[PDB]
């Protein structure tokens, strides 16, 4: 996240950290995700696309740091890894970029509620906040586009939703952004999501609930002028989600 504050998981108790094992001994961070229900985490298909071997990914809930433990965290294996059929990538956009991970712990249970583990709410069929709403994104991604390491402490920031009209202006992204995508930027292009933030949540409030409005998907550069971050529009995938949960 460029800009932002450092936070602890108590402020995003539904945030999930997905790592990949290299039996060589190391585990690396892959992307972020969100807990929908006790056993399901949602993230972005492009995070798994190149190496869809579920057996090698680990998911942690209640983690405030990237490579050090947090007390209260839970670790799970991925029981099911559902990527979206019709996912596509072009010179910038990722289409149908949402993924579901069914988790199971070594004891055979799913997430349990605590002060560091909570689920986030889903929106209702094609129900979104209006552009202008300020939402928050969270994650362990880069702090500057030139960095080559990720922060060790979780970060969070606030970004505002912009309209498609604004985001599809030719000097922004043109028709690369569809109606199954959402754009969010900072008025002063000072904070944004970035490499390593893929899969995490864009939470806005809808009807009185903190709702998972978008999934960090792509962006040209990070905190660049006229280059909003693009998120998958969860409200447009509700049936897809239902058909698998």
């Amino acid at each position: 996240i460029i800009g932002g504050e450092f936070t602890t998981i108590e402020n995003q108790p539904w945030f999930a950290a997905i790592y990949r094992r290299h039996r060589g001994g190391s585990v690396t961070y892959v992307c972020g995700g969100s807990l929908m229900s006790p056993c399901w985490v949602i993230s972005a298909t492009h995070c798994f696309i190149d190496y869809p071997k579920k057996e090698d990914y680990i998911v942690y809930l209640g983690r405030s740091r990237l490579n050090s433990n947090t007390q209260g965290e839970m670790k799970f294996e991925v029981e099911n890894l559902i990527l979206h059929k019709d996912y596509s990538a072009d010179t910038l956009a990722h289409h149908n970029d949402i993924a579901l991970l069914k988790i199971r712990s070594k004891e055979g249970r799913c997430a349990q509620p605590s002060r560091t583990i909570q689920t986030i709410c889903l929106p209702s069929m094609y129900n979104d906040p209006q552009f202008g709403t300020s939402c928050e994104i969270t994650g362990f991604g880069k702090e500057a586009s030139t960095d080559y390491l990720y922060p060790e402490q979780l970060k969070m920031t606030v970004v505002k939703l912009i309209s498609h009209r604004e985001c599809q202006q030719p000097h922004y992204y043109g028709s690369e952004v569809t109606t199954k995508m959402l754009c969010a930027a900072d008025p002063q292009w000072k904070t944004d999501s970035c490499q390593g933030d893929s899969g995490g949540p864009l939470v806005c409030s809808l009807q009185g609930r903190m709702t998972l409005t978008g999934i960090v998907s792509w962006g040209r550069g990070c905190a660049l002028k006229d280059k909003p971050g693009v998120y998958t529009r969860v409200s447009h995938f509700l049936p897809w989600i239902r058909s698998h949960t």
Partner: peptide, 9 residues
């Protein structure tokens, strides 16, 4: 005990 989506505190 049980989840309440969206509730932090």
């Amino acid at each position: 005990l049980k989840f309440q989506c969206g509730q932090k505190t």
